[PDB]
Coordinates of C-alpha atoms and ligand atoms in Angstrom, one line a residue:
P32 CA -0.1 -0.3 -0.9
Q33 CA 0.6 3.7 -0.2
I34 CA 2.1 3.8 3.8
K35 CA 5.2 1.0 2.9
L36 CA 6.3 5.0 1.1
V37 CA 5.7 7.4 4.1
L38 CA 8.0 4.7 5.7
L39 CA 10.8 4.2 3.4
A40 CA 10.7 8.1 3.5
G41 CA 11.0 8.4 7.6
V42 CA 14.1 6.3 8.5
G43 CA 15.6 7.9 5.6
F44 CA 15.0 11.3 7.8
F45 CA 16.0 8.6 11.1
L46 CA 18.9 8.0 9.4
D47 CA 20.2 12.0 8.3
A48 CA 19.6 12.9 11.9
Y49 CA 21.2 10.6 13.1
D50 CA 24.0 10.7 11.9
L51 CA 23.7 14.7 11.6
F52 CA 23.4 15.3 15.7
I53 CA 25.5 12.3 16.7
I54 CA 28.5 14.2 16.6
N55 CA 27.2 15.7 18.5
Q56 CA 27.8 13.0 21.2
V57 CA 31.0 11.7 19.4
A58 CA 33.1 15.5 20.1
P59 CA 33.4 14.9 24.0
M60 CA 35.4 11.6 23.0
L61 CA 37.1 13.2 21.2
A62 CA 38.3 15.8 23.5
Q63 CA 39.1 13.3 26.5
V64 CA 41.1 11.0 23.5
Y65 CA 43.4 14.0 21.4
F66 CA 42.9 16.7 23.8
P67 CA 42.4 15.4 27.2
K68 CA 44.3 19.3 28.7
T69 CA 42.6 21.8 26.8
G70 CA 39.3 21.5 25.0
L71 CA 38.8 20.5 21.4
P72 CA 40.1 24.2 19.7
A73 CA 37.4 26.4 18.7
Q74 CA 37.4 26.7 15.5
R75 CA 37.8 23.4 14.6
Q76 CA 35.3 22.0 16.3
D77 CA 32.5 24.5 15.1
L78 CA 34.0 24.0 11.0
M79 CA 33.6 20.0 11.9
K80 CA 30.6 20.5 12.8
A81 CA 29.2 22.4 10.4
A82 CA 30.4 20.6 7.9
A83 CA 27.4 18.2 8.0
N84 CA 25.2 20.9 7.5
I85 CA 27.6 22.9 5.1
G86 CA 27.6 19.7 2.7
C87 CA 24.4 19.3 3.1
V88 CA 23.0 22.7 1.1
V89 CA 26.0 21.4 -1.4
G90 CA 24.3 18.3 -1.7
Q91 CA 20.4 19.5 -2.7
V92 CA 22.2 21.7 -5.4
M93 CA 24.0 19.2 -6.8
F94 CA 21.8 15.8 -6.5
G95 CA 19.4 19.1 -7.7
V96 CA 21.2 19.3 -10.9
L97 CA 21.6 15.6 -11.4
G98 CA 18.3 14.9 -10.6
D99 CA 16.3 17.9 -13.1
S100 CA 19.0 16.9 -16.1
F101 CA 19.2 12.9 -16.6
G102 CA 16.1 12.3 -14.0
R103 CA 15.3 10.6 -10.4
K104 CA 16.1 6.9 -12.6
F105 CA 20.2 9.2 -11.3
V106 CA 19.7 9.7 -8.4
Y107 CA 17.7 7.8 -6.0
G108 CA 20.7 5.2 -5.2
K109 CA 24.0 6.8 -4.7
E110 CA 23.2 9.5 -2.2
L111 CA 22.8 6.5 -0.1
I112 CA 26.1 5.6 -0.8
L113 CA 28.0 8.0 -0.1
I114 CA 26.5 9.1 2.9
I115 CA 28.0 5.0 3.7
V116 CA 31.3 5.3 2.9
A117 CA 31.4 8.9 3.9
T118 CA 30.8 7.2 7.8
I119 CA 33.1 4.4 6.7
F120 CA 36.1 6.9 6.3
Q121 CA 35.2 9.3 9.4
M122 CA 34.9 5.7 11.6
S123 CA 38.2 4.4 10.5
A124 CA 40.5 7.6 10.8
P125 CA 44.3 6.5 11.7
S126 CA 44.0 6.5 15.2
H127 CA 47.6 6.9 15.5
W128 CA 46.9 10.5 14.1
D129 CA 47.9 14.2 15.2
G130 CA 45.1 14.8 17.1
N131 CA 44.7 18.0 14.8
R132 CA 44.9 16.2 12.2
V133 CA 42.4 13.2 12.8
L134 CA 40.1 16.7 13.8
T135 CA 41.2 17.5 9.8
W136 CA 40.4 13.9 8.5
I137 CA 36.5 13.9 10.0
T138 CA 35.6 17.8 9.2
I139 CA 36.2 16.5 5.8
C140 CA 34.9 13.5 5.1
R141 CA 31.4 15.0 7.6
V142 CA 31.6 17.5 4.2
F143 CA 30.8 14.2 1.8
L144 CA 29.3 13.8 4.7
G145 CA 27.0 16.3 4.3
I146 CA 26.3 16.1 0.6
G147 CA 24.6 13.0 0.8
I148 CA 22.6 13.9 4.0
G149 CA 21.9 16.6 1.2
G150 CA 19.7 14.2 -1.2
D151 CA 17.3 13.0 -0.1
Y152 CA 15.7 15.9 2.7
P153 CA 13.2 17.1 0.5
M154 CA 12.8 14.6 -2.0
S155 CA 11.0 13.4 1.0
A156 CA 8.7 16.2 1.5
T157 CA 6.6 16.7 -1.8
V158 CA 6.7 13.1 -2.3
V159 CA 3.4 13.1 0.1
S160 CA 2.5 17.8 -0.1
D161 CA 1.6 16.1 -3.9
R162 CA -0.2 13.2 -3.1
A163 CA -1.9 13.2 0.0
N164 CA -3.7 16.6 -1.1
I165 CA -6.0 16.5 2.2
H166 CA -6.5 17.9 5.0
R167 CA -4.2 15.3 6.4
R168 CA -1.3 15.9 5.3
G169 CA -0.4 18.3 8.9
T170 CA -0.7 15.2 10.5
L171 CA 1.7 12.7 8.0
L172 CA 4.4 15.3 6.8
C173 CA 5.2 16.2 10.8
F174 CA 4.7 11.7 11.0
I175 CA 7.3 11.7 9.0
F176 CA 9.7 14.9 10.0
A177 CA 9.3 13.5 14.1
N178 CA 12.2 10.6 13.5
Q179 CA 14.7 14.0 13.5
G180 CA 13.8 13.3 17.2
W181 CA 13.9 9.1 17.1
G182 CA 17.9 10.3 15.2
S183 CA 19.1 12.6 17.9
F184 CA 17.4 10.5 21.5
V185 CA 18.3 6.4 19.6
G186 CA 22.2 8.3 19.7
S187 CA 21.9 9.7 23.3
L188 CA 20.3 6.2 23.7
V189 CA 23.3 4.2 22.0
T190 CA 25.8 6.1 23.8
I191 CA 25.0 5.5 27.6
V192 CA 24.7 1.9 25.9
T193 CA 27.9 2.0 24.9
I194 CA 29.7 3.9 27.9
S195 CA 28.6 1.8 30.3
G196 CA 29.4 -1.4 28.5
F197 CA 33.1 -0.2 28.6
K198 CA 32.1 0.8 31.8
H199 CA 34.8 -2.0 33.6
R200 CA 37.4 -1.5 31.0
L201 CA 37.4 2.2 32.1
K202 CA 37.5 2.0 35.7
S203 CA 40.4 -1.0 35.4
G204 CA 43.0 1.4 33.2
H205 CA 42.3 1.7 29.7
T206 CA 41.7 4.6 29.2
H207 CA 42.5 4.8 25.5
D208 CA 39.3 3.0 24.7
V209 CA 36.5 6.1 24.5
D210 CA 39.1 6.2 20.8
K211 CA 36.6 3.6 19.9
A212 CA 33.7 4.3 21.8
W213 CA 32.8 7.4 18.7
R214 CA 33.9 4.9 16.2
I215 CA 31.0 2.9 17.8
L216 CA 28.9 5.8 17.8
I217 CA 29.5 6.2 13.9
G218 CA 29.2 3.6 12.9
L219 CA 25.8 2.2 14.5
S220 CA 23.8 4.1 11.6
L221 CA 25.9 1.7 9.0
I222 CA 23.0 -1.6 9.9
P223 CA 20.0 0.6 8.7
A224 CA 21.7 2.8 6.0
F225 CA 22.6 -1.0 4.5
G226 CA 19.6 -2.2 5.4
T227 CA 17.7 0.7 3.4
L228 CA 20.3 0.7 0.6
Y229 CA 18.5 -2.9 0.2
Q230 CA 15.0 -2.2 0.3
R231 CA 15.9 1.3 -2.2
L232 CA 16.9 -1.3 -4.1
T233 CA 15.0 -5.2 -3.7
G290 CA 16.2 23.1 -24.9
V291 CA 17.2 22.2 -20.9
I292 CA 18.0 26.0 -20.8
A293 CA 15.4 27.4 -22.3
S294 CA 12.6 25.2 -19.8
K295 CA 14.9 26.7 -17.1
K296 CA 14.8 30.4 -17.9
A297 CA 10.5 29.5 -18.9
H298 CA 10.5 28.5 -15.8
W299 CA 12.4 31.6 -14.1
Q300 CA 9.9 33.6 -15.9
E301 CA 7.2 32.0 -14.4
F302 CA 9.0 32.3 -10.6
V303 CA 9.6 36.1 -10.9
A304 CA 6.1 36.8 -11.9
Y305 CA 4.5 35.5 -9.1
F306 CA 7.1 36.7 -6.1
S307 CA 6.6 40.4 -7.8
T308 CA 2.6 40.3 -6.5
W309 CA 3.0 41.8 -2.2
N310 CA 0.0 39.1 -1.4
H311 CA 2.5 36.1 -3.3
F312 CA 6.5 37.8 -2.3
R313 CA 5.6 37.5 1.7
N314 CA 4.7 34.2 1.6
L315 CA 8.0 33.5 0.1
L316 CA 9.8 35.6 2.7
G317 CA 7.7 34.5 5.7
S318 CA 8.7 31.3 5.3
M319 CA 12.6 32.6 3.9
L320 CA 12.6 34.1 7.3
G321 CA 11.1 31.7 9.6
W322 CA 12.9 28.8 8.5
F323 CA 16.6 31.0 9.0
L324 CA 15.6 32.2 12.0
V325 CA 15.0 29.3 13.5
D326 CA 17.8 26.7 12.5
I327 CA 20.5 30.0 14.1
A328 CA 19.1 28.3 17.6
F329 CA 17.8 24.9 16.6
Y330 CA 21.6 24.2 15.2
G331 CA 23.6 26.4 17.1
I332 CA 22.8 24.7 19.9
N333 CA 21.9 20.9 19.5
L334 CA 24.8 21.0 16.9
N335 CA 26.6 22.0 21.5
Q336 CA 24.3 20.3 23.2
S337 CA 27.5 18.9 25.4
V338 CA 28.8 22.2 25.3
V339 CA 25.7 24.1 27.5
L340 CA 25.0 21.0 29.4
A341 CA 28.9 21.8 30.8
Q342 CA 28.1 25.4 32.2
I343 CA 25.5 24.1 33.8
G344 CA 26.1 21.1 36.1
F345 CA 26.5 18.5 34.2
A346 CA 30.9 19.0 34.2
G347 CA 33.1 18.8 36.7
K348 CA 36.7 19.2 38.4
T349 CA 35.4 15.4 40.6
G350 CA 35.3 11.9 38.9
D351 CA 37.4 10.2 36.9
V352 CA 37.0 9.2 32.7
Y353 CA 33.7 7.1 32.9
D354 CA 32.2 9.1 35.7
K355 CA 33.1 12.2 33.0
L356 CA 31.7 11.1 30.2
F357 CA 28.6 8.7 31.4
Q358 CA 27.1 12.5 33.3
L359 CA 27.6 14.1 30.7
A360 CA 25.5 11.4 28.3
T361 CA 22.6 11.5 31.0
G362 CA 22.3 14.8 30.4
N363 CA 21.8 14.7 27.4
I364 CA 19.5 11.7 27.2
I365 CA 17.3 13.8 30.2
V366 CA 16.8 16.8 27.5
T367 CA 16.1 15.2 24.2
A368 CA 14.1 12.4 26.1
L369 CA 11.9 14.9 28.3
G370 CA 11.8 18.4 25.7
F371 CA 13.8 17.2 22.6
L372 CA 11.2 13.7 21.2
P373 CA 8.1 14.7 22.8
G374 CA 7.7 18.1 21.0
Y375 CA 7.2 16.6 18.1
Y376 CA 4.2 14.8 19.4
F377 CA 2.2 17.6 20.4
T378 CA 2.7 19.6 17.2
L379 CA 1.2 15.9 15.3
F380 CA -1.8 15.9 17.5
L381 CA -1.6 19.1 17.8
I382 CA -1.4 21.0 13.8
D383 CA -4.6 20.1 12.0
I384 CA -6.5 21.6 15.3
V385 CA -4.7 24.9 16.2
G386 CA -2.9 25.7 12.8
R387 CA 0.5 26.1 11.9
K388 CA 0.9 29.8 12.4
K389 CA -0.5 29.7 16.1
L390 CA 2.1 27.6 16.7
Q391 CA 5.2 28.7 15.4
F392 CA 3.7 32.5 17.7
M393 CA 3.8 30.2 20.5
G394 CA 6.9 28.0 19.7
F395 CA 9.5 31.4 19.1
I396 CA 7.8 33.2 21.3
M397 CA 8.2 30.1 23.7
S398 CA 11.6 29.6 23.0
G399 CA 12.9 32.8 23.5
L400 CA 11.9 32.6 27.4
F401 CA 14.2 29.8 28.5
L402 CA 16.4 31.8 26.4
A403 CA 16.0 34.6 28.0
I404 CA 15.6 32.5 30.9
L405 CA 19.1 30.8 29.9
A406 CA 20.9 34.2 29.0
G407 CA 19.8 36.3 32.3
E408 CA 20.5 33.3 35.2
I409 CA 22.9 31.1 33.3
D410 CA 26.2 32.3 34.9
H411 CA 23.4 32.4 39.0
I412 CA 21.6 30.1 39.3
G413 CA 22.3 26.5 40.6
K414 CA 21.5 23.7 37.4
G415 CA 18.3 22.2 38.7
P416 CA 15.5 25.3 36.8
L417 CA 18.7 25.4 34.1
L418 CA 18.6 22.0 33.1
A419 CA 14.6 23.0 32.9
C420 CA 14.6 25.9 30.9
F421 CA 16.7 24.9 29.3
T422 CA 15.0 21.1 28.1
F423 CA 11.5 23.7 28.2
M424 CA 13.4 25.2 25.2
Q425 CA 13.6 22.5 23.0
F426 CA 10.5 21.0 24.0
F427 CA 9.6 24.4 22.3
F428 CA 12.0 24.6 19.4
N429 CA 10.0 20.7 18.6
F430 CA 6.1 22.4 19.0
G431 CA 6.7 24.9 18.0
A432 CA 8.7 26.7 14.8
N433 CA 11.8 24.6 14.1
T434 CA 8.7 21.4 12.5
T435 CA 6.5 23.9 11.8
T436 CA 8.4 25.9 8.9
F437 CA 9.5 22.8 7.7
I438 CA 5.2 22.0 7.3
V439 CA 5.1 25.3 6.2
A440 CA 7.1 26.0 2.8
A441 CA 5.6 22.4 1.9
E442 CA 2.5 24.3 2.6
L443 CA 2.3 27.3 1.0
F444 CA 3.4 26.8 -2.3
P445 CA 1.2 25.7 -5.6
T446 CA 2.2 22.9 -7.3
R447 CA 3.3 24.9 -10.3
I448 CA 6.6 26.7 -8.9
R449 CA 6.8 25.0 -5.4
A450 CA 9.8 22.3 -5.8
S451 CA 11.3 26.1 -6.2
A452 CA 9.8 27.4 -3.5
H453 CA 10.3 24.9 -1.1
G454 CA 13.6 24.8 -2.1
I455 CA 14.9 27.8 -1.9
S456 CA 13.4 28.4 2.3
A457 CA 15.3 25.0 3.2
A458 CA 18.4 26.4 1.6
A459 CA 17.1 29.6 4.0
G460 CA 17.2 26.9 7.0
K461 CA 20.8 25.5 6.5
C462 CA 22.5 29.0 6.0
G463 CA 21.1 29.6 9.2
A464 CA 22.3 26.8 10.3
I465 CA 25.6 27.1 8.8
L466 CA 25.9 30.6 10.8
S467 CA 25.1 29.4 14.2
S468 CA 27.4 26.7 13.1
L469 CA 30.3 27.3 12.4
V470 CA 30.5 30.1 15.2
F471 CA 29.1 29.4 18.4
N472 CA 32.0 27.7 20.3
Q473 CA 34.6 31.1 19.0
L474 CA 31.8 33.6 20.0
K475 CA 31.3 31.8 22.7
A476 CA 34.9 32.1 23.7
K477 CA 35.3 36.2 22.5
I478 CA 32.0 37.4 24.7
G479 CA 30.6 34.1 26.3
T480 CA 27.5 31.7 26.5
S481 CA 25.2 34.8 28.3
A482 CA 25.1 36.9 25.3
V483 CA 25.4 34.3 22.9
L484 CA 22.1 33.0 24.7
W485 CA 21.1 36.7 23.8
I486 CA 21.4 36.1 20.1
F487 CA 19.6 32.8 20.2
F488 CA 17.2 35.6 21.9
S489 CA 16.6 38.1 19.6
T490 CA 16.6 35.9 16.7
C491 CA 13.3 33.9 18.0
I492 CA 11.8 37.3 18.4
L493 CA 12.2 38.5 14.8
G494 CA 11.5 34.9 14.3
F495 CA 7.9 35.3 16.1
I496 CA 7.9 38.9 14.2
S497 CA 8.3 37.3 11.2
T498 CA 5.6 34.8 12.0
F499 CA 2.8 37.8 10.4
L500 CA 3.8 36.7 7.0
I501 CA 2.4 34.0 6.5
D502 CA -1.3 32.5 5.4
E503 CA -2.6 30.3 7.7
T504 CA -2.6 26.5 5.7
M505 CA -4.9 24.8 7.9
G506 CA -7.5 22.7 5.1
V507 CA -6.4 25.4 2.8
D508 CA -5.0 23.9 -0.8
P509 CA -2.6 26.2 -2.4
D510 CA -3.6 24.9 -5.5
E511 CA -7.6 25.6 -5.7
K512 CA -6.2 28.6 -3.9
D513 CA -4.1 29.9 -6.4
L514 CA -6.2 28.2 -8.9
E515 CA -9.5 31.0 -7.9
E516 CA -7.0 33.8 -7.2
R517 CA -6.7 33.4 -11.5
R518 CA -10.4 33.0 -11.9
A519 CA -10.7 35.9 -9.9
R520 CA -8.7 38.6 -12.4
Ligands
BNG601 C1 32.2 9.5 0.5 C2 34.0 10.7 0.2 C3 34.6 10.3 0.9 C4 35.9 11.8 1.7 C5 37.0 11.1 2.3 C6 37.9 12.2 2.0 C7 38.6 12.8 3.1 C8 40.3 13.8 2.8 C9 41.7 13.0 3.3 O1 42.0 14.6 3.7 C10 43.0 15.1 3.4 O2 43.9 13.8 4.3 C11 45.3 14.8 4.9 C12 43.6 15.7 6.2 O3 44.8 15.6 7.7 C13 45.5 16.2 4.9 O4 46.9 16.1 4.2 C14 44.6 16.9 3.9 O5 44.8 18.2 3.9 C15 43.3 15.7 2.9 O6 43.3 16.8 2.3
BNG602 C1 36.1 1.5 1.9 C2 37.4 2.1 2.0 C3 37.1 1.3 3.8 C4 38.4 1.8 4.6 C5 38.5 0.5 5.5 C6 40.4 0.4 5.7 C7 39.8 0.1 7.3 C8 41.6 0.1 8.5 C9 41.6 -0.4 9.7 O1 42.4 1.2 10.3 C10 42.0 0.9 11.5 O2 41.1 1.7 12.6 C11 41.4 1.6 13.7 C12 40.6 1.9 14.6 O3 38.7 1.8 13.7 C13 42.3 2.6 13.8 O4 42.9 2.2 15.4 C14 43.6 2.1 12.8 O5 44.6 3.6 13.2 C15 43.7 2.8 10.8 O6 44.4 2.4 10.5
BNG603 C1 7.6 47.8 6.8 C2 7.4 46.5 7.3 C3 6.0 46.4 7.2 C4 5.4 44.5 6.7 C5 4.5 44.6 7.3 C6 4.1 43.4 7.8 C7 2.8 42.2 6.2 C8 1.4 42.3 7.3 C9 1.4 41.0 5.6 O1 0.2 41.1 6.5 C10 -0.8 39.7 5.0 O2 -2.2 40.5 5.2 C11 -3.2 39.5 4.8 C12 -4.3 39.3 4.4 O3 -4.6 40.1 2.9 C13 -2.8 38.2 5.8 O4 -3.2 36.8 5.2 C14 -2.0 37.7 6.5 O5 -1.9 37.0 7.9 C15 -1.6 39.3 6.9 O6 0.2 38.9 7.0

């Protein structure tokens, strides 16, 4: 039936999300091995974490040209082997290498990993926004998207299971085995990746200039232009805070009480992994499901308004209190923030970009919005740990706060898409003039 295809798109998101966010769990292990006394150098850590998102935009433009030039049959398999191969190179950095060289190895691998993650990313959204043509398209897009939560959660679960498996060996003095742990964290993605590879198998300028002419004509009208403006702005603005925080969740949990001077190597990695699992289990993950049950009841806009403005509050509390109040209150607010990312702006920007636009131009408008998002992701990703050193963590969280208020403001540019057919509205718009 139609069901099996949406699951396959789901496992595509799951694998993309796992590979993206697992770097947050891998980085503190790389620190313990290759930079035990100092931290990972700020610029190198930022480059390593932005790498996958940088490749992600290169992927969907490149796999876009090839997919348009020679059709969908050209791309469907090749994107997945690229992330499999990129996973294996990343997994197998020479252990006898110098720390900066190991880091540079992983960043480059993660760019190519990103290029593949850039493959199926918008194509899993289109297949069911085109297919459904029903009020329950939002509940469907949201169900596919929720696999981003499971990607981050399973990575955290994999991490505590892995560390607690190495418990006795680390306690008995074999401290280099954390170099084997971080390879297992990346490597375990290969199990669904190979599973899915097998399941997936078992006048060009004249046309482009004609589509460009329709696109420009469409988005040169205000009530049509602002919907593209608001779609680009909302996705751009939320990804600054969202990927800034989530690619560095282990870093924030370290000003909060979860990193300390007490305890040994196991005690360190294990409470830090304990902090990560709490946040994603209690906040990051359930937010997707609160959205799932309410988008086709409350509407998309009311959920972004709430999402931006609620995550703003907890960012302001973090920014104001992080250096001044105890662990507990901060851990709660940080979890509340994560909850209202996914019960809110992060989930709705994705749906709104897929739902706003009539099909005759939907491909570009969704692509331009997704590209705008990745731009916001790479700014914070490229600079988060550098700013944290130049201006401090509280000052960065004040920046994230401001982007949430701008997101709230920009959401007024959008039409509510709950229950609307964008092709019909385009249709009456035209029969009306
Ligand atoms: C599926 C795609 C696979 C991509 C894997 C390519 C890894 C690139 C290897 O990096 C190279 O090795 C050293 C890194 O420390 C440096 O000598 C050199 O500057 C750098 O270019
Ligand atoms: C399709 C190309 C795939 C090539 C994979 C070759 C892997 C060779 C083994 O690598 C080794 O991995 C160990 C940790 O796992 C490190 O201790 C060691 O330094 C490194 O040499
Ligand atoms: C100098 C900055 C000024 C920009 C002003 C904000 C633009 C608001 C656009 O109004 C729009 O009118 C539509 C009805 O036609 C509503 O459906 C939609 O919700 C609403 O967003």
